[PDB]
């Protein structure tokens, strides 16, 4: 039950019969039953920040008066 | 058993590891979440809301109120500056307080564009024209209107819409700009001058403040993260 | 076409209304409108009770007064409509109960004066105390003021007497009352009344904590905090003053755990 | 500096109680394990310790007639001295720690302590 | 969709413009804040943008372990009269400040925390005597089991908390533990209190701190040296270091600007200026 | 297509020529250099090419780890009034000469860095007592982070910066670094300065050193002895060595003739000489 | 995921029903979500020198004169 | 856990060891290469250009 | 001969492309020939009380009278 | 063998573990379990079992 | 099948009652 996920790879070495290229691969396997054990997986989400900058009831168009 | 050999970091503690860890509590009945409003996800997001700026941070100004408001006049026109600012967000005193400086605080690098927005909160008589500005850094900072004019810049007509915003555009030679007072990764120069003079009628108070906010926009990013200097413990 | 506008609004809920002519659109928090408790979310068992239009209407705190000299105030939530009608009433009957909330700061003045007012919806907004011998030392009825809320000063003076210390809070304004700086408030949802451009400041907040429901006499989820950010100024008179009014309006607030009713030391 | 002040002492006779008192000047953002001990001749003892609260921890000859308490807020200890015994003629004093539950004669200051006679018949 | 990882928008080439479209003129009455790109307020090229948010994920950012407390052993002479060597703490994060500030950025939080411990040791007076590698023993007691009375008694057996016996010398102790809040979600802060004060009831009966509550007991730990007295005197150091893996966060705070003053929000006459002189007009 | 390890081209047999073509013959002021093969000049035979470069790529070339600084600690008499015990340097690769030589081989360069770290101690003053194992703590300070004041402050709580807590007498530590670069590659020279000196200024207002800029700051790393002190004085070192993986290179250069001397191109007074004395007409 | 490559085989031992012979590989499993904490490929490319060599404009043809 | 058995070479820091190791500053945003003329990828190319020989190196 | 079950997650990573969501298993081997060696799996049973509760001859009903 | 680096946490004792151990005594022939009466499954069985309480704690 | 990681029983939602059901009354005496 492994689990194979691609790294973003930034420095490149001169390879692309091995390394640097054809994408690098990293595996993980959970060893313990509690999920609590697991490392950080680190594959996050982003979001629209909406709901802290533009939290008015009325959709804000940026071309437009604010007010109107 | 299997053969195995240790290699070099074998042991170590390194505190920016990411390794599973036998868990202390097993088959332990953890509480399900609920769906709590204002989930943040990135610190960026908070990077990207306004936040005022203490700009008047006068000797009597400084840790009072007073260090928000930055006070125009119905005087005649003059090419003398209203303010004055360095674009370094995490280092110059007037950026480094506000929510981006301080995220910003927490990393060495910075990079992206930012954007200063400017309410005027004087009475709906009086009337107005200002020019924001930013130079980018290499040649004397802008000291005159004449300067100013030069570089980028947004004339604001103070009018209905009570408030302008000024894009700092992302203009610099490395990809990254340190996160403290640096030369080679230095910003430039923000400032705010009178285009034409604020004009009231009679029975007005004739003189009013400005408040300034400070944000990122959605190119905005930061990098490698360190410990902040602005918390400590003694002892 | 037909002149709709951000400025213009109307609320109405239960049997009162509310409109005004000078808004700034409004601000619904965290982008949440207020909900009721969801079976998937729920927690006491008990069939709940909801008051609906019995308490979910608008209610009109005691108005303060605005001057030169004003470093702000603030106020809690249920707390400060713990007086209320049957809001009040459910509110000491039940040992849990959950509300969300339509506050409605207003204040007008005139073209010729100036100013402008942050009125900050904080959730969890714990304030400062006033000694420096003992932390987290005020009292149940200074922390709870109801309808007539506390205010903010110009400077921390730490309370001395150790025999019979105050006990209340002595929250500094530029610190927010709670030690950090005021000019990031504005990461709470919230809006500024500005005087040459409205008259009134409105912010729909969702009901916030750690739990589904809690209990209302002993926890205020939201604080709201209205400090002035640029100061009072009309026409060149020494001492204006124009006053500020808050109207606030629960909603889908529901209540479990009823027994005999509460009654709180106060004083 | 940080300065702890001792008060309540007095001379009592046997049989008798006390109840000593110990607040700091200032609030310590630090210590919240408090102290107390005692002296005769040329060697300190331990009488108790309390941290927070309600952990408290006594000696093997103060146990069952010493109670510590202390305020979970202020930082401040007190000490309840019952069905007093001649041998407990000493000089009390206070030590703030950081988190100490354990006792040992090694604090930085010393304040100035309590004196506590005890009178026989 | 949009992982941490991705590359950020692209800046799109925009020219002059001169019309009745406004994006530089807004109103910051209304609460929200202007959504700006360059090309609204300037002329821009075209730019592919390659930088990523990836290490300001609320993840990455508290990827760092850090210390909380410094607990501490002792011993004397012989006995002489004294038995009470082991050390227990409160857990609490709230007794440094680096940590604590980090956390406070937000109002709620959830997280799986590990548990990592550095354990140092020393020589205390010039001696020819040699101690032999010892053996320590970390004990979570819960809130509500026994807490240790003497060095030896019967709670060290440690039939149900789970204890950690860490050997001098090899790699530092570690432990996972769950989210174990009693809400669906850890109270940084919490306005209000524990107890109602009723007024048919005397004012201490109904007295309780501000800000205080059962969301944030979690009990103690318990450390001492297993060995056996040893002629030579051997004091010991456990550093804990927390960090909170699996996180999410709730309601954005401004950060602490004044130095902290106890578990609360309170703060200290002398302490309130974290802005220094700077003139108005001058870069 | 062509790999590292693959094998050089044959040479090819060749007999005796007569003819226009002149290989031979060439012009050096044009900035080629001639292209020339055994065959072009002598007759050659068929020769099935083995060889290969394989251990001349530029990864294989910077395969070794490389020595960098030597920190060290103190302890006194006791305290006296000495409690500055902890060691912060400056990181940069220039301090040696073996791989500073190695990197100026070539202009630019991108590459991940691995550090280890081999750390020894030892008693000073010949004494009975007897020292517990250590261990130690590596904090990388990048950039802006407050640096340490005293051996116990704040500091060294580290809720952000990465640190290695180093067991003394198991497997030296290592760790791996990105690029870190604010540019898209290190720049082993820079011809320049990261100030402009104007005219409307002073003259000191606008003065900074030939050839450095920010683009080689990277902040420092402070070592500490975590266990506390002893009243056997024990010094230790850490020796940093560093190995550039994944790496590129650009722009040739001519390899450092004379002895280095500062972070800079300086060169000292007296080691100008790098040639001996050898005649024109001597074997 | 683990990755296979082949060695570069130099000593042969007396074998080839195992070692020597049969092509002999070797095998890589990443461990790590960063792609700098992996080990160096080694597997690099190889290119013309003549951008350093012959940098000239007109292209050289050795068998001609260098000047015309 | 799995059975294991010490090899010799254990422990010991081989300079021109290849072996992968936990990187200090994980999620880092590293900034992205540009084509900056002139990459050398093996050392003998520099080998074939043609330097300058110092033939007379007699005392003055 | 690898075991893989699932884990039961309760506290989610800002994840669904890695942990969190994706159903997040564990992978378990045995390594000795002797079952008591094996560690717990911790994937256990529940029974109704009943045995204890309402070791009653004749079913009881609820809603009925118990004594009827 | 096998190139492997140590974790922090290796040789400690967590007394709330759970991993494999080796046996002291291989081979043995385990009796077989009987179906007696009354097996648990889960102490909240015995939770839900009716007892009595003891309401009158007066000094007598 | 019920393993004991699952869930609890759910509540139902229950309105009033009035009827001959009496699931309150009980006998002890039996052993249940
Ligand atoms: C020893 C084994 C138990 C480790 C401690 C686990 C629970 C501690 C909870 C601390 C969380 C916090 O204060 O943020
Ligand atoms: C301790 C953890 C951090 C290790 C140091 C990483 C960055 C140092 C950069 C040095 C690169 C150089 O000077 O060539």
């Known amino acids: 039950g492994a689990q194979v996920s691609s790294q973003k790879v930034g420095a490149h070495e001169n390879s692309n019969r091995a390394y640097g290229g054809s994408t690098i691969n990293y595996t993980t396997i959970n060893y313990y039953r509690d999920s609590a054990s697991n490392a950080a997986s680190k594959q996050d989400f982003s979001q629209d920040p909406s709901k802290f900058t533009e939290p008015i009831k009325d959709v804000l168009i940026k071309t437009a008066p604010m007010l109107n | 058993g299997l053969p195995v050999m240790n290699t070099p970091g074998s042991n170590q503690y390194l505190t920016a590891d990411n390794f599973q860890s036998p868990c202390a509590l097993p088959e332990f009945d953890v509480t399900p979440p609920i769906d709590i409003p204002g989930e943040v996800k990135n610190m960026m997001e908070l990077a990207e809301i306004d936040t005022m700026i203490p700009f008047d941070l006068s000797a009597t100004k400084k840790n009072t109120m007073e260090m928000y408001r930055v006070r125009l006049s119905d005087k005649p026109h003059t090419d003398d500056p209203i303010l004055c600012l360095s674009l370094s967000p995490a280092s110059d005193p007037r950026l480094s307080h506000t929510m981006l400086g301080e995220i910003l605080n927490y990393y060495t690098h910075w990079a992206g564009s930012l954007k200063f927005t400017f309410l005027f909160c004087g009475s709906m008589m009086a009337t107005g024209k200002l020019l924001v500005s930013y130079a980018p850094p290499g040649a004397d900072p802008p000291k005159k209107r004449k300067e100013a004019m030069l570089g980028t810049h947004v004339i604001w007509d103070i009018g209905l819409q009570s408030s302008c915003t000024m894009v700092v555009p992302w203009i610099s030679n490395t990809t990254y700009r340190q996160t403290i007072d640096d030369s080679f990764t230095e910003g430039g120069y923000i400032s705010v001058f009178y285009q034409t003079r604020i004009v009231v009628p009679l029975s007005t108070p004739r003189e009013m403040d400005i408040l300034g906010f400070v944000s990122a926009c959605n190119d905005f990013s930061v990098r490698l993260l360190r410990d902040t200097t602005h918390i400590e413990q003694k002892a | 076409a037909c002149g709709y506008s951000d400025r213009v609004l109307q609320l109405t809920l239960g049997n009162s209304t509310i409109t005004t002519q000078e808004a700034a659109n409004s601000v619904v928090a965290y982008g949440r409108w207020p909900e009721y408790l969801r079976d998937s979310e729920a927690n006491p068992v008990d069939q709940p009770t909801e008051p609906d239009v019995a308490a979910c209407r608008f209610y009109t705190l005691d108005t303060v007064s605005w001057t030169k000299e004003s470093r702000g105030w603030w106020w809690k939530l249920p707390d400060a409509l713990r007086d209320m009608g049957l809001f009040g009433q459910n509110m000491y009957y039940h040992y849990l109960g959950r509300s969300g909330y339509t506050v409605h700061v207003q204040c007008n003045a005139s073209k010729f004066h100036q100013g402008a007012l942050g009125v900050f919806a904080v959730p969890e907004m714990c304030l400062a105390g006033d000694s420096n011998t003992t932390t987290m030392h005020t009292s149940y009825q200074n922390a709870n003021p109801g309808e007539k809320g506390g205010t903010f000063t110009g400077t921390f003076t730490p309370d001395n007497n150790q025999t019979s210390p105050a006990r209340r809070f002595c929250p500094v304004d530029y610190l927010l009352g709670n030690g950090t700086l005021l000019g990031n408030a504005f990461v709470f949802p919230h809006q500024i009344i500005n005087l040459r451009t409205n008259n009134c400041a409105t912010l729909v907040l969702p009901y916030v904590n750690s739990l589904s429901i809690d209990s209302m006499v002993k926890h205020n989820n939201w604080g709201i905090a209205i400090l002035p950010l640029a100061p009072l100024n009309f026409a060149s008179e020494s001492s204006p003053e124009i006053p500020i009014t808050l109207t606030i309006a629960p909603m889908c607030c529901e209540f479990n755990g009823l027994r005999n009713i509460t009654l709180p030391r106060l004083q | 500096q940080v300065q702890l002040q001792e008060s309540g002492g007095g001379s009592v006779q046997a049989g008798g109680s006390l109840r000593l008192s110990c607040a700091a000047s200032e609030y310590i953002p630090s210590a919240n394990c408090m102290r107390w001990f005692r002296q005769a001749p040329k060697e300190r003892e331990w009488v108790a310790s309390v941290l927070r609260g309600g952990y408290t921890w006594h000696a093997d000859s103060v146990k069952g007639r010493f109670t510590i308490s202390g305020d979970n807020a202020k930082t401040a200890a007190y000490l309840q001295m019952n069905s007093l015994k001649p041998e407990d003629t000493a000089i009390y004093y206070c030590?703030?720690?950081?988190?100490?539950?354990?006792?040992?004669?090694?604090?930085?200051?010393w304040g100035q302590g309590t004196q506590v006679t005890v009178s026989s018949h | 969709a949009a992982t941490s990882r991705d590359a950020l928008p692209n800046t799109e080439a925009s020219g002059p413009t001169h019309s009745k479209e406004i994006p530089a003129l807004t109103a910051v009455e209304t609460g929200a804040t202007n959504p700006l790109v360059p090309s609204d307020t300037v002329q821009t090229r075209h730019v592919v943008q390659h930088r990523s948010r990836s290490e300001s994920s609320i993840e990455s950012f508290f990827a760092r372990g850090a210390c909380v407390t410094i607990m501490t052993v002792d011993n004397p002479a012989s006995t002489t009269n004294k038995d009470k060597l082991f050390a227990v703490w409160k857990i609490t994060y709230k007794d440094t400040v680096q940590l604590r500030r980090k956390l406070e950025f937000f109002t709620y939080s959830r997280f799986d925390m590990e548990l990592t411990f550095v354990v140092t040791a020393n020589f205390t007076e010039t001696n020819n005597g040699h101690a032999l590698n010892q053996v320590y023993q970390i004990m979570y007691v819960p809130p509500g089991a026994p807490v240790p009375e003497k060095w030896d008694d019967y709670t060290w057996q440690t039939s149900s908390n789970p204890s950690i016996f860490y050997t001098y010398g090899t790699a530092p102790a570690r432990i996972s533990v769950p989210y174990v809040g009693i809400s669906n979600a850890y109270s940084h802060f919490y306005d209000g209190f524990s107890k109602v004060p009723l007024k048919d009831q005397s004012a201490a009966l109904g007295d309780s701190l501000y800000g205080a509550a059962s969301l944030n007991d979690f009990g103690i730990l318990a450390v001492r040296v297993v060995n056996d007295h040893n002629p030579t005197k051997v004091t010991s150091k456990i550093r804990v270091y927390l960090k909170p893996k699996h996180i999410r966060v709730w309601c954005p705070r401004p950060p602490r600007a004044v130095a902290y003053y106890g578990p609360g929000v309170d703060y200290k006459d002398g302490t309130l200026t974290p802005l220094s002189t700077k003139d108005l007009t001058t870069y | 297509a062509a790999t590292s390890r693959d094998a050089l081209p044959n040479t090819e047999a060749s007999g005796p020529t007569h003819s226009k073509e002149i290989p031979a013959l060439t012009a050096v002021e044009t900035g080629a250099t001639n292209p020339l093969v055994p065959s072009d000049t002598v007759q050659t035979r068929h020769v099935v090419q083995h060889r290969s470069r394989s251990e001349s790529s530029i990864e294989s070339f910077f395969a070794r780890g490389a020595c960098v600084t030597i920190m060290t600690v103190d302890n006194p008499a006791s305290t006296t009034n000495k409690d500055k015990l902890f060691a912060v340097w400056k990181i940069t690769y220039k301090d040696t000469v073996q791989l500073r030589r190695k990197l100026e081989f070539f202009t630019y360069s991108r590459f991940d860095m691995e550090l280890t770290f081999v750390v020894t101690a030892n008693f000073t003053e010949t004494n009975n007592g007897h020292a517990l194992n250590q261990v130690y703590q590596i904090m990388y300070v990048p950039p802006g982070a407050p640096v340490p004041e005293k051996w116990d402050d704040y500091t060294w709580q580290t809720s952000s910066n990465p640190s290695i807590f180093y067991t003394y007498g198991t497997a030296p530590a290592r760790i791996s670094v990105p690029y870190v670069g604010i540019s898209n590659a290190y720049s082993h020279f820079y011809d320049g300065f990261s100030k402009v000196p104007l005219k409307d200024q002073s003259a000191a207002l606008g003065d900074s050193l030939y050839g450095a800029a920010s683009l080689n700051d990277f902040g420092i790393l402070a070592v500490r002895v975590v266990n506390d002190h002893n009243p056997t004085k024990v010094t230790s070192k850490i020796r940093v060595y560093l190995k550039p993986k994944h790496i590129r290179v650009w722009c040739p250069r001519p390899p450092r003739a004379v002895a280095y001397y500062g972070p800079g191109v300086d060169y000292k007074d007296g080691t100008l000489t790098p040639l001996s004395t050898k005649d024109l007409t001597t074997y | 995921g683990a990755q296979v490559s082949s060695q570069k085989v130099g000593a042969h031992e007396n074998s080839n029903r195992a070692y020597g012979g049969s092509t002999i590989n070797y095998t890589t499993i990443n461990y790590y979500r960063d792609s700098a904490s992996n080990a160096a490929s080694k597997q690099d490319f190889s290119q013309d020198p003549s951008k350093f060599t012959e940098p000239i404009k007109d292209v050289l043809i050795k068998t001609a004169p260098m000047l015309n | 856990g799995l059975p294991v058995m010490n090899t010799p070479g254990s422990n010991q820091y081989l300079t021109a060891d290849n072996f992968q190791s936990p990187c200090a500053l994980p999620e880092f945003d590293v900034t992205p290469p540009i084509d900056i003329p002139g990459e050398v990828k093996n050392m003998m190319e520099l080998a074939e250009i043609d330097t300058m020989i110092p033939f007379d190196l007699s005392a003055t | 001969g690898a075991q893989v079950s699932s884990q039961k997650v309760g506290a989610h990573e800002n994840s669904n492309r890695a942990y969190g969501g994706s159903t997040i298993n564990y992978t378990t081997i045995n390594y000795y020939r002797d079952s008591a060696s094996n560690a717990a799996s911790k994937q256990d049973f529940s029974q109704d009380p009943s045995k204890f509760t309402e070791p009653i001859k004749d079913v009881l009903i609820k809603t009925a009278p118990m004594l009827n | 063998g096998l190139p492997v680096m140590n974790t922090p946490g290796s040789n400690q004792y967590l007394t709330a573990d759970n991993f494999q151990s080796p046996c002291a005594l291989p081979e043995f022939d385990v009796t077989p379990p009987i179906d007696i009466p009354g097996e648990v499954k889960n102490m909240m069985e015995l939770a839900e079992i009716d007892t009595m309480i003891p309401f009158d704690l007066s000094a007598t | 099948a019920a393993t004991s990681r699952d869930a609890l029983p759910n509540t139902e939602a229950s309105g009033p009652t009035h009827s001959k059901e009496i699931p309150a009354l009980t006998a002890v005496e039996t052993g249940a």
């Open positions: 030590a703030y720690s950081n988190t100490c539950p354990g006792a040992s004669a090694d604090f930085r200051s």
